[PDB]
Amino acid sequence: MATGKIVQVIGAVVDVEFPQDAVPRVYDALEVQNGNERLVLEVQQQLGGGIVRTIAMGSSDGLRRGLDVKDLEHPIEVPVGKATLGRIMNVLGEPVDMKGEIGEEER
């Protein structure tokens, strides 16, 4: 389930508020549906009560206030090992060479 909501969007910087139990830790990765397309946010700061300031790892345009945000409980983690040889990947470890899924065994 998704437990946070966007409260600001200023350029690339997005503020998300959680109930004060579930506040993500710093460098945790969040996720939100920016339209028909997924977008992940990396927590930079825990400021004030419940609110968390993040940097969007992607296009910020199209974000509304009040979108539901789901917090992955781990930092940005990428596929590793022999499976990645000869592939191209972006910062999130997704393939950008159009040869399809990576075939990772471990992240």
């Binding site: 004060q20 009560g49 419940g50």
Partner: protein, 173 residues
């Protein structure tokens, strides 16, 4: 200090209280809220970073003296803006807007000795002409001034004391 951030809230609370002819209930409700703000434990909670809709509810819990719709709504707005500490000033400016609306004023009269109660009658009769407002008086005594009287009405004062005459003579020379 919250003299400036209190003005909008006092004005809104008064304009609302007038529409419903409940000015007195609103004044007592604000006077209670501004008191719960002063308690030792609540003043601790108001400073720590709680989420607004949690701080507001914990504050509402401590008051059954607030008419559940319109007083609690004011508390919720002030909490959303992070201004619950401004209530002690919302109260003062509410009283001020009321005194203006009802054309009332309150004059301090400061003297070396208490007055003869005919002087007070003439003073009130005079000020109710200097000002359109029906005036209360608060007589006060101060033996630094030694004759005459000081009349202070708001930020206006009439320095009738002989102490003033002396200090104002000294600076002519």
């Amino acid at each position: 200090e919250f003299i400036t951030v209190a003005r909008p809230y006092a004005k809104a609370a008064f304009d609302f209280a007038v529409e419903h002819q409940s000015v007195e209930r609103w004044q007592d409700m604000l006077a209670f809220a501004a008191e719960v703000t002063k308690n030792e434990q609540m003043a601790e909670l108001l400073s720590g970073a709680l989420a607004p809709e949690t701080l507001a509810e914990s504050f509402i819990a401590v008051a059954g003296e607030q008419l559940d719709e319109n007083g609690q709504n004011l508390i919720r707005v002030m909490a959303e803006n992070g201004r619950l500490n401004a209530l002690p000033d919302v109260l003062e400016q509410f009283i001020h807007l009321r005194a203006v609306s009802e054309a009332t004023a309150e004059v301090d009269v400061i003297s070396a000795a208490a007055l003869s109660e005919q002087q007070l009658a003439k003073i009130s009769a005079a000020m109710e002409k200097r000002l359109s407002r029906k005036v209360k008086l608060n007589a006060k005594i101060d033996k630094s001034v030694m004759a005459g009287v000081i009349i202070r009405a708001g930020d206006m004062v009439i320095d009738g004391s002989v102490r003033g005459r002396l200090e104002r003579l000294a600076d002519v020379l």
